Amino acid sequence: EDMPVERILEAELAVEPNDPVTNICQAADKQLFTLVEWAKRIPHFSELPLDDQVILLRAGWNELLIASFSHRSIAVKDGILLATGLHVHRNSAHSAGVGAIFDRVLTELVSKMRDMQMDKTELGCLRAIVLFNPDSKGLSNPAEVEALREKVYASLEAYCKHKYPEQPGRFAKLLLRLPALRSIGLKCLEHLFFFKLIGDTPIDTFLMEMLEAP
């Protein structure tokens, strides 16, 4: 066990906390600082070269944040809970002109996480898989990252089989939220690039740094 699910859960538990789009952007900036602390507690992340640690977090931050507020929001009806303590109701999101992408988050992520009772170990592992993205451009050693990804999904499958032996399809169900998370990430990014371009919305320095070119 070079990738124990106990350490991945510890990482989740260690970091656990009108324009709605202004509140969302403040929350995203705040959570980017927490995301660096989270990543440092994932086994073997901090032993990668610093340039590769940067490429992985620049590639994955939007998906990692989306995964976290989505899991956080499973107790909420028709909304999301931000790390800042604030709720965005689907009605506010529709009235701010981001209804369609907000409903995608509710339907494809929050609802599906709620229905299967995805647990914080499962969430941690999915986020670790996102983080260890071996397709990220410019990695010095994509094979090392691929090896870390393989160890995360080996540990996750063993955890699922042990913890939920009645649900043989559960491992595959977890992995098959990742295409939805990818598509929703890209659409959320497109919204952010627009907010920046129109200048309609304050963007704080870490969020702004993540939107700057590579």
């Binding site: 660096v36 610093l50 640690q53 940067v54 977090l57 320095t205 740094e209 700057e212």
Partner: peptide, 13 residues
């Protein structure tokens, strides 16, 4: 040019 991310990743604690 990613000042803030480099600084946070380097700092141990």
């Amino acid at each position: 040019k990613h000042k803030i991310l480099h600084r946070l990743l380097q700092d141990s604690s």
